[PDB]
Amino acid sequence: SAYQDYLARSRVGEGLALAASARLAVAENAASGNGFSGGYVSPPATRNVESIRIDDDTGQIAIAFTARVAAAGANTLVLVPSVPDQADTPTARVALSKGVIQAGTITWECFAGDKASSSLPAPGAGPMPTDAPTLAGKLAPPECRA
């Protein structure tokens, strides 16, 4: 129902905001050439957010929501970071490179479970999720959707 979607979307948006902590951790580790989950302490679990985790190799962030939001196994959103292949007049986007000093601006793309390709502006597509998200796009903000 439209009303049920409203409840879920509000809570999913809160989860995405709470994941700012992880986006900052990934950026700090990228700036120092460290594994991207290094030093990251996720905030307390809430009634709506079960966990926020960082992939140490790619910097992808997985947000798992509680059953208040979506069923188990259909409850995860993924945020994918990328950088331009070169800062000046890029021709493509590339996944983060573990161990490399990368202090430039990171672009994050949100993927819900039904989003089958990257949809970023110039310089083009970002990487796909490593672990696939499972949250239905209808429950997520529009830029996470197919």
Q: Residue 136 maps to which CATH number?
A: 3.30.700.10
With both helix axes pointing from N to C terminus, report the angle between 20-32 and 2-18 in degrees, rounded to the nearest 10. Answer: 30
List the determination method.
X-ray
Residue 82, domain member (yes or no): yes
CA–CA separation, 27 and 79 (whole Å):
13
Resolution of this model in Å is 1.5
CA–CA separation, 54 and 5 (whole Å):
27
Residue 145, domain member (yes or no): no
Total tally of structural domains belonging to the chain: 1
Which ranges constitute the DSSP H helices of 19-75? Answer: 20-32
- Range of 87's domain? 2-140
CA–CA separation, 50 and 36 (whole Å):
20
8 A C-beta contact, residue 118 and residue 109: yes
Residue 83, domain member (yes or no): yes
Residue 62, domain member (yes or no): yes
H or E stretch covering 5: helix 2-18
